[PDB]
Scaffold this active site. Structure first.
Site, PDB file in Angstrom:
ATOM      1  N   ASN B  26       0.814  -1.195   0.000  1.00 30.44           N
ATOM      2  CA  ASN B  26       0.000   0.000   0.000  1.00 30.44           C
ATOM      3  C   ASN B  26       0.849   1.247   0.000  1.00 30.44           C
ATOM      4  OD1 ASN B  26      -1.469   2.345   1.371  1.00 30.44           O
ATOM      5  ND2 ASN B  26      -3.153   0.930   0.893  1.00 30.44           N
ATOM      6  N   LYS B  60       0.550   9.867   0.822  1.00 34.51           N
ATOM      7  CA  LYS B  60      -0.781   9.609   1.358  1.00 34.51           C
ATOM      8  C   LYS B  60      -1.508  10.947   1.500  1.00 34.51           C
ATOM      9  CE  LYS B  60      -1.877   6.584   1.011  1.00 34.51           C
ATOM     10  NZ  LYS B  60      -2.950   5.574   0.786  1.00 34.51           N
ATOM     11  N   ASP B 238      -6.818   0.687   7.894  1.00 33.17           N
ATOM     12  CA  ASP B 238      -7.998   0.817   7.054  1.00 33.17           C
ATOM     13  C   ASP B 238      -7.719   1.395   5.677  1.00 33.17           C
ATOM     14  OD1 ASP B 238     -10.250  -0.443   8.093  1.00 33.17           O
ATOM     15  OD2 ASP B 238     -10.733   1.208   9.457  1.00 33.17           O
TER      16      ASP B 238
END
Lengths: 272, 272, 272, 272
Positions: B26, B60, B238
């Site tokens: 990720n 991010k 999450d």
């Protein structure tokens, strides 16, 4: 339980106060148009007795084709709200898209605005978190009403505690939106009871703008967001669904009669 | 009807060709992690015989709290893919968020990527339209499969005609996603038959990553996007739902057996 | 964890066993048609090696206009399955609607069937609970996959413990259905692992019956429910979407290749 | 455009007339309860000035477990409405489930009712089509607002032209309902403008029964369907969500103030 008030100058937005209208147009095509539109609003509100915050977009980030009408631009758009402020004495609410546009507009306008598509954009939020100006978070269509806590939290931190939540419906299958009238309380709740407003025109991707605006208001709301155009027909494109100027008044009479009848009801508890 | 091929170096992505894996992680936490992860992929793919494009995020933009792990940053993140390229000889696929990050990364990496939240962002698209590098459009959860024409059109114009469409499910009520297995063909169709890939891990907000990956592949796809982590548990947070490294192989054997069995079927017409 | 087996005569239906086809037609128009249809199935199955349970409806309870083709009727419909049984030696599966039709048909046919619209009908269920014959519960479109416990429970009590669950998609907005490929496991689970089957033709209110059937099968299923017609076109009406007889075989080869490749995979755990 | 009126005795139900309340309870537990409930309604309505049609169910077809409280039964249930009619002088509205129950109840009660689950049941409809008594079609949760034409058509044919449409929300993902406030006009339209009523308690599978009832009424409706219980808490089970008797009045004052304010507005056209 009292409601959080978020004052925009002399105007106080809040869930138990009479609704505030954040009317206006979609994009700033031409001042001769802005001026006319905003002229009609001011007059109609003033006459009926409704707080107001003219709204318009000086920039179009997600338009069709690259070869389309971007928009006045931030440097030329801002100059327009200038003239409208003086000539009319009304509040300006506009949407920013890039973390740099934050401060410039913060001066020029009263209430800024965060787009749903970006709702989840820390850099842009934090940049808006700085300015300290009144924030309006557009509730994304793909996010439940109870997720609006983190957004308001991420703003508290940024040092900004003047926030309004705008609901514009939720996805209902493909290419369709339905407005959950239960979403409004679930939003007041998780947001320290911040103001919640309904973007009726944008929740309607018609002769329906009214029945849907009545249901929203009857729930009881801090405000109401809408857009109108002199000639909806010919000008029709896509995104929202503007209201016909010539119908502002008979449509706003509808709301007041509701927003007042409901705004003064004896608190009821169907809970027990 | 033939499929549009979009080659990433020596790799050719296309709906009737064997599926390409765009595996990885990720975010780029630490090279010691990137290196390990990408090490395990390379080995597993190489062994089983699957094209591959390691994927990871150096930034991010929509994280929780301002006081969170932004990410390596564009200037420090890019240096990492550098080392991985040499040390492993694999393609790098990463997501950009601001119109300026476009070109820098375009050099460093093989396949860039457009986030759904921004899918509808002309400036950012046009900036990506420039670079000319391979584009990967993430299908927003709030947009039907047949709206993916304008996105690919808005890229053709930008002078970029190397595009892949990534599906990650659609909103099903509040806080939930369902993947419409019929959406994949409706996407091939409106996109000049461009490559369509399935982001299984991201369509799952479990012991479900497999059954759902099989259904996707059985439909017949150009590719498959996924993420894995050495320790999914403890590290759980999450957004997506990473696959357990130690299960890559027995999970990829599943796909090949499907992607091959199906990829070589005699064209069928249930139409008439 | 082993799967519950529900045997229909010499046939054993179960989630880890090779899939059983419950093919056939929609309604019993005319034996010359039934006979032809069922003739083609039997031959195709027999040849490819697939268990089979011809399916057809002798009654139409929810049709358009009162002045429509009700159907053969229970007393004349049942006589048809009679002839087909002898002439072909296949199992008959039909749907009942009134608590009295239960027993009569129970004799005549192998596997009865409960309609979704009535899924929640105690009297009719209990009447079917009596007969003791194999039950097939059609998963209503307006009910989540995890609610299928009470239905199977309400049957255990009735003294009937031979049940199959049939999934035909879920409502996705207005007038639309999407099949959640994750719903199949959530159904195995809450039903003591009873057999789960996919009604592909009915989950499609097209040249799509195939891609959608592959995804379903790749998940891994106890069975598959479908309908076909010699001439889908001209005969087209509404409700389901029949498969073209002439395509049965090349379509069933698709399934076997999937149902076998998957039905013999080494149990995988993406859980940890 | 005038609205179709459907008179229930001296009561005239219609979209532009003041709303009619079809209050009452869920099931007929015991007359000592029915009597109390219906006593409180009658008094509250009578006092505030609202037409009324006490509602209650004498039969429970889709309950949990076979070993549950079926209900008084048709032969014992009907005897109760008898006593309530004389003792109070109010209209009775009840739901039938089997084609035979039609006529019996037709005499005993004023307004019968068709359950959504069966909405699509020709035999049962035709049997209700006979009686000729006032019909109330419950809009299924899995059917769009514009499909309500065939239902009303299938009743015209049956010789019955006295129909009311009841909306109770639509499926929103799994195990959830949202009420589309735009569905009410789309229903008036396709039904020759027949009366449309909102079943608020049943659209709520809370302290929400009010805000949701206000939005419904503000749209403008022929009527309103609801259920109340002396002690919602302890008695709580599932299906609907009853209103607390003690809150009837302050809740009905809410509606009148809305249904009157709106019911007397100057027709507006946001269309042009």
């Amino acid at each position: 339980m009292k409601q959080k008030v978020v004052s925009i100058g002399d105007i106080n937005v809040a869930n138990d106060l009479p609704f505030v209208l954040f009317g206006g147009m979609n994009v700033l095509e031409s001042r001769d148009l802005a001026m006319r539109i905003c002229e009609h609003y001011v007059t109609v509100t003033q006459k009926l007795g409704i707080p107001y915050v003219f709204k318009a977009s000086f920039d179009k980030a997600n338009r069709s084709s690259i070869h389309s009408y971007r928009g006045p631009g931030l440097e030329e758009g801002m100059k327009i709200f200038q003239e409208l402020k003086q000539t009319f004495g009304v509040k300006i609410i506009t949407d920013v898209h890039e973390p740099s546009q934050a401060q410039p507009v913060a001066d020029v306008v009263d209430v800024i605005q965060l787009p749903a598509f970006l709702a989840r954009q820390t850099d842009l939020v934090e940049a808006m978190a700085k300015t300290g100006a009144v924030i309006n978070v557009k509730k994304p269509q793909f996010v439940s009403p109870g997720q609006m806590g983190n957004i308001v939290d991420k703003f508290k931190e940024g040092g900004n505690e003047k926030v309004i939540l705008c609901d514009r419906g939720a996805n209902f299958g493909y290419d369709n939106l339905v407005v959950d009238m239960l979403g409004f309380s679930i939003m007041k709740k998780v947001s320290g009871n911040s103001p919640v407003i309904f973007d009726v025109t944008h929740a309607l991707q018609r002769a329906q703008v009214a029945e849907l605006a009545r249901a929203g208001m009857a729930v009881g709301l801090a405000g109401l967001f809408i857009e109108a155009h002199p000639d909806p027909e010919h000008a029709k494109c896509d995104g929202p669904s503007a209201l016909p100027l010539a119908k502002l008044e008979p449509f706003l009479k509808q709301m007041k009669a509701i927003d007042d009848l409901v705004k003064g009801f004896e608190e009821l508890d169907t809970s027990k």
